[PDB]
Amino acid sequence: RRELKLLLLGTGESGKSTFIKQMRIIHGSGYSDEDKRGFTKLVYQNIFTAMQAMIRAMDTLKIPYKYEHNKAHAQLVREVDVEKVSAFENPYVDAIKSLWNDPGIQECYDRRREYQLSDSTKYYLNDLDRVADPSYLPTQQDVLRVRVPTTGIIEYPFDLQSVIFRMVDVGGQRSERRKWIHCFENVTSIMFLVALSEYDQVLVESDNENRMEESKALFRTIITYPWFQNSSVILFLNKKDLLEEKIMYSHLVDYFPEYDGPQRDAQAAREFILKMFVDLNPDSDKIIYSHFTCATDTENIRFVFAAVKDTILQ
Amino acid sequence: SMLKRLSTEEATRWADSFDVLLSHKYGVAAFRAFLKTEFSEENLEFWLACEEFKKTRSTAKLVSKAHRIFEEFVDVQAPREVNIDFQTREATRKNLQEPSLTCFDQAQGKVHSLMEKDSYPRFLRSKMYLDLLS
Numbered sequence: 001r002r003e004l005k006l007l008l009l010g011t012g013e014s015g016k017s018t019f020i021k022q023m024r025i026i027h028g029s030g031y032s033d034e035d036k037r038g039f040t041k042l043v044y045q046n047i048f049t050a051m052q053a054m055i056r057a058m059d060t061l062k063i064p065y066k067y068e069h070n071k072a073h074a075q076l077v078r079e080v081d082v083e084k085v086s087a088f089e090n091p092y093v094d095a096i097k098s099l100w101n102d103p104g105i106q107e108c109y110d111r112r113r114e115y116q117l118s119d120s121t122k123y124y125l126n127d128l129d130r131v132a133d134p135s136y137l138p139t140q141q142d143v144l145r146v147r148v149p150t151t152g153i154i155e156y157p158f159d160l161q162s163v164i165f166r167m168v169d170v171g172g173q174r175s176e177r178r179k180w181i182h183c184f185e186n187v188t189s190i191m192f193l194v195a196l197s198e199y200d201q202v203l204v205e206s207d208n209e210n211r212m213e214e215s216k217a218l219f220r221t222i223i224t225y226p227w228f229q230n231s232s233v234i235l236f237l238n239k240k241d242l243l244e245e246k247i248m249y250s251h252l253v254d255y256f257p258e259y260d261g262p263q264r265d266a267q268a269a270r271e272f273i274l275k276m277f278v279d280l281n282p283d284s285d286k287i288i289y290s291h292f293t294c295a296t297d298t299e300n301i302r303f304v305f306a307a308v309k310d311t312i313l314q
Numbered sequence: 315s316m317l318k319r320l321s322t323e324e325a326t327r328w329a330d331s332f333d334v335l336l337s338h339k340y341g342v343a344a345f346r347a348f349l350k351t352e353f354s355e356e357n358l359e360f361w362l363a364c365e366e367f368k369k370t371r372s373t374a375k376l377v378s379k380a381h382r383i384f385e386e387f388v389d390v391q392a393p394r395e396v397n398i399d400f401q402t403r404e405a406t407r408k409n410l411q412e413p414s415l416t417c418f419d420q421a422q423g424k425v426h427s428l429m430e431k432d433s434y435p436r437f438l439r440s441k442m443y444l445d446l447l448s
């Protein structure tokens with residue numbers, strides 16, 4: 001009956017809902033074989049939606065297909081209403097496998113920062129045979145990977161033996177933020193998520209605004225709120241795994257020209273990002289606790305929860 | 315004979331699909347109650363306002379009604395702003411300058427989608443819904 005309220009805040013796509021799923025795996029009722037079947041259709045839909053994005057991007061960016069047969073496949077795939085998708089069959093399976101293989105589409109994917117494409121694309125697209133199998137059953141990892149946008153404010157209680165954690169998940173897009181006031185009361189602690197990999201991206205909500213500039217502005221605002229002066233603040237710099245990949249091809253200095261460290265170096269990059277965040281409130285002497293996280297990594301998230309509970313909240 | 319309980323059946327029907335739920339008057343109402351506890355009822359209000367806007371007969375009424383709906387749900391800083399992307403917002407603004415019955419199809423779709431994949435499944439696992447089954 002001893003109870004603590006913890007907010008998960010952050011801009012859209014930071015990984016807030018993924019944290020909730022991990023709580024469910026580590027401290028809640030987990031995911032049964034039956035639960036996993038409920039995610040099948042979403043997996044399919046994420047795949048179609050991702051390929052449709054790339055297909056429209058091929059035009060917008062003026063990238064030609066390398067193989068002619070792939071145009072017909074793109075016509076086929078573009079005509080699909082993703083809402084009505086419930087199975088993943090040929091000719092759609094082979095069209096998508098075949099599209100994903102075109103060096104054109106691969107350029108388009110490498111240039112994904114210039115449009116909007118969901119983070120788990122590569123993970124699904126490299127594994128279409130597994131997913132296509134007539135009797136495919138999503139793994140726990142497929143479930144952690146799936147994209148479903150959150151709207152509103154939602155409370156998930158979880159019983160850790162000694163204490164109840166009341167975790168609050170929220171929508172992160174601008175329009176959603178006006179509602180946050182509804183969870184700001186009696187907050188023990190805040191877990192603010194930032195996507196390490198969002199440095200070269202722009203917001204979905206708006207026209208050509210940098211996603212990381214947005215997280216900074218938001219973090220700064222939260223930290224200054226006086227009703228949070230006694231709430232502990234934990235900054236999770238999430239998606240550190242995607243950072244490892246992306247840093248090899250997309251240079252941080254091209255987005256944050258103050259970065260004077262080496263190129264193609266994930267560690268220096270993430271230290272610079274961390275530093276930027278910590279430097280937003282020079283007049284506050286309030287503590288920021290941070291950790292680099294990978295929200296889709298259960299072991300990584302298990303640790304991060306034990307440490308908040310064992311160290312920070314006692 | 316085989317017994318089936320009318321309220322058990324009704325509530326079960328709501329779980330067949332979200333479109334089924336939306337055609338059950340008591341489904342809509344249960345779902346709305348739920349949205350309100352998640353502060354996301356503007357999604358359903360917007361959606362309903364579009365279904366109704368599709369019914370309009372007078373062109374005169376159509377024009378100003380499109381403006382009301384946009385000012386109310388779509389524009390940035392709208393009092394009941396729905397979570398949609400920049401493109402859908404802007405496509406809607408373009409549509410607005412020569413308004414028709416399809417003016418909000420794109421936006422109504424995104425919102426439909428939002429509800430369907432996020433709130434609806436959670437509602438089906440809610441205690442409020444589950445209590446109506448046993």
Ligand SMILES: Nc1nc2c(ncn2[C@@H]2O[C@H](COP(=O)(O)OP(=O)(O)O)[C@@H](O)[C@H]2O)c(=O)[nH]1
Nearest residue numbers: 013014015016017018144145146147239294295
């Ligand atoms: N690889 C990787 N994917 C992540 C990580 N965190 C979140 N994701 C994925 O990114 C997408 C968006 O995460 P989500 O939790 O839905 O965002 P939010 O709830 O809007 O903050 C989902 O597809 C997640 O699977 C991460 O640390 N690593």
Ligand code: ALF
Nearest residue numbers: 012013149150172
């Ligand atoms: F973009 Al979100 F939960 F913040 F889906």
Ligand SMILES: [Mg+2]
Nearest residue numbers: 016017149150
């Ligand atoms: Mg979410």
